[PDB]
Amino acid sequence: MKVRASVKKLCRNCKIVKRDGVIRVICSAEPKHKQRQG
Amino acid sequence: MIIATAGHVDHGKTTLLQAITGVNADRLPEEKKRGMTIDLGYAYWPQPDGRVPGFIDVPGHEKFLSNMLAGVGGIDHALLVVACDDGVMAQTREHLAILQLTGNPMLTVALTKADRVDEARVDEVERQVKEVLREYGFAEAKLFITAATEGRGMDALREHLLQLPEREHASQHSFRLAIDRAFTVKGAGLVVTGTALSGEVKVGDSLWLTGVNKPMRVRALHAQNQPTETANAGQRIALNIAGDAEKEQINRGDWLLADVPPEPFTRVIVELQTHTPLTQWQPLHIHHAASHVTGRVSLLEDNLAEL
Amino acid sequence: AKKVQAYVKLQVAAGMANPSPPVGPALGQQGVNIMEFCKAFNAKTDSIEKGLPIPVVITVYADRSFTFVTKTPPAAVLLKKAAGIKSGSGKPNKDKVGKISRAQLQEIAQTKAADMTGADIEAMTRSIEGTARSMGLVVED
RNA sequence: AGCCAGGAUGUUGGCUUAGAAGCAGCCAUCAUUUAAAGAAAGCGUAAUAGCUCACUGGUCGAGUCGGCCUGCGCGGAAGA
């Protein structure tokens, strides 16, 4: 989790999802890549 | 009838000794503070019969092994306590191997924790012990299954205790004493306690203390909580001695004996018996009764070695 | 002898039986007898020349041994010792390591021809030579 | 697009050797078995096993790929 304003994809398993209207990044295999509010 | 108790730690060996003798083995505050037998403690069982069997409780720890090695000198009989809960422990098997190598004439296996286990486990551990005896080349052994807190096996144990030989010694042997615990009592000097390998001693006798290299007159002695004018080999001997020697030079594993030894030698040959063969010129611990040494072994013909 | 378990084509030079520093325990991790990798290891070793780092297939099973077959010497060092000049470049376009001719390597490689893939003999020839030319040597043509 | 399967061998590849073998790089910058096979796009690891992916097949059955101009909205946006 990090609130950085630019949430570019980092691994192939990273995928954008819009939850509660804010978009998220979740890299299934690699938790550290998880991001917020791009 | 000296019976030294050995076995893996906290398997009731102290409880057994309080059951038979009721002696408090602890002496140093730390072992009192920590509740374990950190170091050797002694029990004795005086009787109207006039013999006092000797009891030596020892740590089952390898770092503490150097003290147990202090206690294994002069044993008449060895009793390895084994809790029925886990059966024989690895420390117990180690002690069994050490007794087989030392050539102890006989040893008794005493099974504890018997009340907590069902009898089926009793017979199973009994079988397992009787198999292990053959593994170590043990001949006679009398297995006693008992809850020492309950006093269960006491009567069965008694007959065996009376069976145990006290070693005889020929009158013609140079007196030899292995020092164990040197502690002054405020009365009358040093009194150092140790096992007598051979010979008799009296208060008028002069002895020769090794490692201090000084003669020492005997002030007094107690045979086994049994003060007397004379002492014979085959028991722990409290020995109160005078002379120029002082505790700073005194060391456990120093010998007290009738005449000045020729000076100690590092090199020695030894017959080997081993569960598996040793290799030439390798570092190892030499452990002798009350003696720690470090040395390298070498192989000569077959089960012959140079230390 | 059984379904796939261990085997891959990897081993050191044929002069080192059961190597300890690059490998040691790593070769003993599974249940093949160590003897296979020392005594039977010299079988292909001195059969040709000592210390040919031929990869060997050994499917370690729990069922005593596995068939010994030390097959193909690696082409890389084979294009060193066979050419005779062990040195090279690693700079394919930036320098020319040297030159041999079709007569040596094209004849040498045929010993491996039974195992090497190819449509025809020359499919293997250009395939090795395209690798050998890319080794920085410019072979005669 | 899923689903089902493949996705080589000389490959511990010249240098440079703890070892970099598709997996920093010297350099991989070939070609070939056939469907291609990246002298390799990810990770795993000292690098190989290991799985993947690009890539080439099979099932499926009607629409589908990735950008440019774009108009309007979202985050970035905390004070008494």
Place this chain on the structure above:
RNA sequence: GGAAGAUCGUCGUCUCCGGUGAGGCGGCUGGACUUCAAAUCCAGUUGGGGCCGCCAGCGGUCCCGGGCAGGUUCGACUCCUGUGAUCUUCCGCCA
């Protein structure tokens, strides 16, 4: 004895170091070395071991050396576990 701690090279001190051991510092022995010094390097601290020819009073073999042993780990003085040894401090030495 017990608990905890420091140290244990390959001449000493230190930096160390997991890529294969190296280096900074130092004392001394000489050489190159001057009238002596000083300095620079060189050369060197040569170490041990089972065994050998031995008493050869020594010299070799192979092997090893960060006290020694053990394991990693792919590879250890290097990481770590022990092991003692010396060394620091403290707990009690109760026939």
